Amino acid sequence: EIQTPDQAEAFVAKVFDVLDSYDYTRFGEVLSTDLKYEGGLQKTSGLDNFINDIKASTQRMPGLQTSHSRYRTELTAEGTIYSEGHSNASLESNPGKVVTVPMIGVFKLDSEDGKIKEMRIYKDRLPFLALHQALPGMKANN
C-alpha cells in the first residue's frame, strides 16, 4: 500500500514503465478493468477502450517510443496522487529526434487491489506534431 509521496512516485514510475512498453497484455497489472481515463479530449471508460485509444495513436505515429520521468509528487488525504514530470516521445525510425513536454498525472486507486481506477493525464500534445516518419538508418533531421 502507498502511504508516502515517495511510494506514490515509485508506483507512478512503475505504471508508466508498463504503459511505455505498449505491451497491452500487462496493462491490467496496474490499471483497473473499469478505468476512467482522460487525456485532453480523449476520454475512455474500461481498460479495453483505453487500449484501443492507444493502439490508434501508435498508428498516427508509426514506431512510437515514449518514456516518462517525475520530479514532484504529492499523495493527498483524499487518496489522490498528483505527479508532475515530463513526457518524451520519438519515432523508432529517427531516434535522434525527441520531443519532451511537461506533464502531470492525476490518479485514484482502487481501495481493494491498488490498481489505477481514474487516470487523468495533462500535457500539451501540440509539440508532438514535430515527430515525423523517416527511413531507418537514413538521416532525416538537420
Q: Return the C-alpha cell found at 5.
A: 509521496
Residue 59 binding its own copies, by CB under 8 A: no
SS3 category, 131? coil
Pairwise CA distance, residues 111 & 79, whole Å: 9
Residue window 111-130: x/- pattern of binding to ligand A1LZH, with contact defined by CB under 6 A: ----------x-x-x--x--
Residue 19 binding ligand A1LZH, by CB under 6 A: yes
The residues in 43-82 that bind ligand A1LZH, with binding defined as CB under 6 A, are 54, 57-58, 66
Pairwise CA distance, residues 36 & 22, whole Å: 19
Residue number with CB closer to ligand A1LZH (4 or 56): 56
The least distance separating ligand A1LZH from the CB of residue 9, rounded to whole angstroms, comes to: 16
| Residues near 77 by beta carbon (within 8 Å), at least 6 away in sequence | none
DSSP per-residue letters across 106-118 = EEEE-TTT--EEE
Site of interaction with ligand A1LZH (CB under 6 A): 19, 39, 42, 54, 57-58, 66, 87, 89, 121, 123, 125, 128
